[PDB]
Each structure stands twice: as C-alpha cells, then as structure tokens.
Amino acid sequence: KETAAAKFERQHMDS
C-alpha cells in the first residue's frame, strides 16, 4: 500500500 515516497510525504510534509 504505502510506498517510501508516500510515507515521507505523510510524515514530513506540511505545506
């Protein structure tokens, strides 16, 4: 389901 890039986004992105 969750890929590494997707995981990075969920964990570190807050535009």
Next chain:
Amino acid sequence: NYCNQMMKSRNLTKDRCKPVNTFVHESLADVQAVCSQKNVACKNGQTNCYQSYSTMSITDCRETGSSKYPNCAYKTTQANKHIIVACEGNPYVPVHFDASV
C-alpha cells in the same frame, strides 16, 4: 501543541511515541526539487543525499524525557534551515529526512 496535534493526526503516534520528527512547511514541489540540488553524503555514509541551496521553514518535534506511551509529549522548535534528504526511484524523489543544517 502543534507537534502533539500533527504527529497524532498524521498517524505517527497513534500506536507508539516517535522520538523525533521534522515537518517541512514548504510546498511538495519545492521539497522534491532538492533531489537535483547539492549532492552530499548522508550521515550513514550513503551518497544519495541532497542538501537544499536555501533554508526552509521547518518544525522540529522532539519527545521530552517525561514522555511515555500512551501519553507522548513533544517539544516544538520552529526554525529555518537547509534540509538534507535522501532520494530514490524514478522520478528521483525524497524517501527519508536525513538532517537540517
């Protein structure tokens, strides 16, 4: 608290307390662009890491010494620093947060 709120909502501390985690308040497009900027070695020795040319708004979330599941506690430190991310795939996109200088 921004860190307690954000970590929770992002499913980060729903089943445990993550000791530390940084949040980047720049657009995703701008953070993805770092994968073609300054090539540097990750702290582990790997070299698929990239440092951003300019500083970025980020918030460091660190558990306090008192924090213990289910009651995680975080200290919120907002700052502006260069970010260092590890990149992989096609396209070359960030997959890990290495550090912030």
